[PDB]
């Protein structure tokens, strides 16, 4: 009967060990290279970020038609909505176009974990169901070799082969309110404002928003 | 009683509600007004293939 549940349980454990090995091993290699570059007097250029998290800051009223279309193609259809975005020349230009309406940056692993674990959900049969078990994730993304929520987190964070199929299943997160800016959300974050690229400082804003 | 003459205001918004209706595939496949000799060549082959097909259908 339900002897497969233990078989399912162990398999999730085995993948979790594999997933954490990949993230830890890749992180270790960066430190070793930085350590050796300093010894040899070289210069080390860190790799550009691959994952971007964008949040919709401004409402739905008074938006240009071209800006309106882009925010729909990024699934930022509501204020205080977060999505993950693959970083390339195509998407970076799009985010610049809608800069006054979004704030984005590069998330850490703990940010990705807390977003998926607390505010995560999937689109199953047209229904936005929150994540409640790995059996609901195995059904949703079985053919994409994602069977557990940890596998979901690892594929998002490392931007794997099936990011697009995995990302499109995740519904855009719904976040709470938080202090957006120092001055106001009418200027860029560089000017002390609210919108624009926050680089690694988006994690602090997401901490108060999750 | 002078009136405003003309405005394009709200005309692009109206045009994109039920947006630009593209033509179907059958619109690009019309052959009216093609080459006269090319039409003669195509018709000659179609009549040759059809007659052969119907002759075979008659045998069986």
């Amino acid at each position: 009967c339900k002897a497969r549940c233990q078989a399912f349980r162990k398999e999730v454990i085995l993948r979790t060990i594999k997933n954490h090995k990949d993230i830890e091993a890749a992180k270790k290699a960066v430190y070793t290279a930085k350590k050796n570059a300093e010894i040899n007097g070289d210069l080390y250029a860190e790799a550009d970020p691959k994952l971007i998290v964008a949040i919709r800051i401004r409402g739905i009223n008074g938006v240009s038609p071209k800006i309106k279309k882009i925010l729909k193609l990024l699934r930022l259809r509501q204020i205080n909505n977060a999505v993950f975005i693959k970083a390339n020349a195509s998407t970076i230009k799009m985010l610049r176009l809608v800069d006054p309406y979004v704030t984005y940056g590069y998330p850490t692993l703990e940010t990705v974990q807390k977003l998926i674990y607390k505010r995560g959900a999937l689109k199953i049969n047209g229904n936005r169901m929150p994540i409640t078990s790995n059996c609901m994730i195995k059904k949703a993304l079985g053919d994409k070799d994602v069977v557990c929520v940890d596998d979901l987190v690892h594929e998002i964070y490392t931007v794997g082969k099936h990011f697009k199929e995995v990302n499109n299943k995740l519904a855009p997160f719904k976040l709470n309110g938080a202090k957006i800016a120092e001055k106001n959300k009418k200027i860029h974050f560089i000017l002390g404002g609210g919108f624009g690229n926050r680089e690694l400082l988006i994690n602090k804003l997401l901490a108060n928003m999750i | 009683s002078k009136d405003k003459n003309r405005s394009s205001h709200n005309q692009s918004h109206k045009a994109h509600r039920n947006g630009f209706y593209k033509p179907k595939k059958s619109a690009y496949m019309s052959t009216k007004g093609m080459n006269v000799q090319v039409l003669k060549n195509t018709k000659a082959q179609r009549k040759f293939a059809l007659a052969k097909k119907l002759e075979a259908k008659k045998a069986a």
């Binding site: 409402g59 739905i60 938006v63 309106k68 925010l71 729909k72 259809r77 509501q78 | -």
Partner: protein, 167 residues
């Protein structure tokens, strides 16, 4: 609020037999159960066609049944509509399942040696559909379709509703 493309309106598909006919309502229940349980595309097709309106359920004559069934000798035509009789041409032997058979059409099928089933007998014999040939009648042969459009058009003119002094 939320910026959607459109708001949810009722989907324009019928999911029940139109009208108060008690027997057609029973057929919808019979095939709604079969489509749901057997999960067969055939019962889904019959259930979908049973809910079309009268104008969307055009007739099929014995002449078209004869031709479509020529290379299907041991088969059962399944047409969700009335079956009329084409008096111009002979009626071969065939088993036909249809909503209604015209008095002249049923006698022509019966005399030739065929069988005029209804849609409950077919569900009893071939519920999932095994020796069936799905058949539907033509829709564009209606006289209304001639007059649709602008008759002044250069490509496909309409047909000019007649009236005062229609030369």
């Amino acid at each position: 609020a939320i910026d959607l493309d459109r708001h949810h309106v009722r989907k324009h598909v019928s999911k029940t037999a139109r009208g108060n006919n008690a027997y057609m309502k029973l057929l919808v229940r019979l095939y709604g159960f079969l489509a749901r349980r057997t999960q067969s595309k055939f019962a889904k097709t019959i259930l979908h066609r049973l809910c079309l309106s009268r104008v969307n359920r055009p007739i099929v004559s014995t002449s078209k049944l004869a031709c479509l069934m020529k290379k299907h000798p041991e088969e059962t035509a399944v047409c969700v509509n009335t079956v009329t009789y084409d008096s111009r041409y002979p009626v071969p032997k065939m088993n036909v399942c249809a909503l209604k058979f015209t008095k002249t059409a049923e006698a022509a099928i019966t005399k030739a040696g065929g069988k005029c089933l209804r849609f409950d007998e077919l569900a009893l014999k071939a519920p999932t559909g095994r020796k069936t040939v799905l058949i539907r009648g033509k829709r564009n042969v209606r006289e209304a379709l001639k007059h649709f459009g602008k008759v002044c058009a250069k490509k496909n003119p309409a047909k000019q509703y007649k009236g005062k002094q229609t030369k």
